[PDB]
Amino acid sequence: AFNADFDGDQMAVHVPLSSFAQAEARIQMLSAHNLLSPASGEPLAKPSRDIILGLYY
Amino acid sequence: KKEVRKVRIALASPEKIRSWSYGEVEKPETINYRTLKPERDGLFDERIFGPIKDYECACGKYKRQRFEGKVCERCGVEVTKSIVRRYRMGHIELATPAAHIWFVKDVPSKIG
């Protein structure tokens, strides 16, 4: 989803203060819920590089 | 108290210029060094724009919250911190008018 590799990439982090902001955040913004992309009905939680390599062999 | 549901830009009536304003800035007196205080009536005067200190007044006749909405007898200071000093408006009264370049130099001269 985020185009991030570990060659030194750095991510920021924010905090939901209201009980509402939290509500939305963990309801409709939490990762484990948005699995299929808005661009295509194709998943985005696809087994990336290493996982396939394993499952393939 | 009520939700802001519509914003509106409209022209400024000179009488509305004055309505928003407090006092007239009538002299190019910023602040005079000896005392880093506002010079005379000038750009920073406390009457024109507001006091520079918390709940307290300029001279200190009234100093806490009990009387939060009243003004001082000999000097004018109604208070809640200097945010007032940053939101208040003052106006300059022009001798012989001049015109807004915003309306005179846009491609279609709105006045032309």
């Binding site: 750095q10 920021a12 203060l17 | 000093r85 408006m89 022009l94 012989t96 008018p97 709105k110």
Partner: protein, 170 residues
């Protein structure tokens, strides 16, 4: 439409055009203020010029300056560009330049603002972690959730009060 003409010039608040003490004892003020003086000085010299007696050429001459000045604060550069004295041939930010400008108001009103409960570090793969969660450095968490912690310190015996709980972690 009679309002397009100007005879009453609104002046922007003071704290928004600060006068401040810097390093060594340097000072710093919003360019707007030099422009304001421009106008006020001219406007006053005008009044006194009318009162003293009035030779035509000189009164217009001033009225011209005056006009120009009234442009300056509103928008600089549409007609000539005002300069602070020899040091920086820089357009004194005109009220306009404040709104639009290179890096103005509506502009940077959308470039970004800084969040209060934010943080940022290097990232690193978390294999065992589940999609659900994420690994966050406690050391970061502490500052991030400081107030949420403070109070929770008071709910437990770790600290008597907030200010305490604060110094406890300073």
């Amino acid at each position: 439409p009679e309002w397009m003409i100007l005879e009453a010039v609104p002046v922007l608040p003071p704290d928004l055009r600060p006068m401040v003490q810097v390093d060594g004892g340097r000072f710093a003020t919003s360019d707007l203020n030099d422009l304001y003086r421009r106008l006020i000085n001219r406007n006053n010299r005008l009044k006194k010029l009318l009162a003293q007696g009035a030779p035509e050429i000189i009164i217009r001459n001033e009225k011209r300056m005056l006009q120009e000045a009234v442009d300056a604060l509103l928008d600089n550069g549409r007609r000539g560009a005002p300069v602070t004295n020899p040091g920086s041939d820089r357009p004194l930010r005109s009220l306009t330049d404040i709104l639009s400008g290179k890096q103005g108001r509506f502009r940077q009103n959308l470039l970004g603002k800084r969040v209060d409960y934010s943080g940022r570090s290097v990232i690193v793969v978390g294999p065992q972690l589940k999609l659900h969660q994420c690994g966050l450095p406690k050391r970061m968490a502490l500052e991030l959730f400081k107030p949420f912690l403070l109070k929770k310190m008071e709910e437990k015996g770790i600290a008597p009060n907030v200010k305490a709980a604060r110094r406890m972690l300073e």
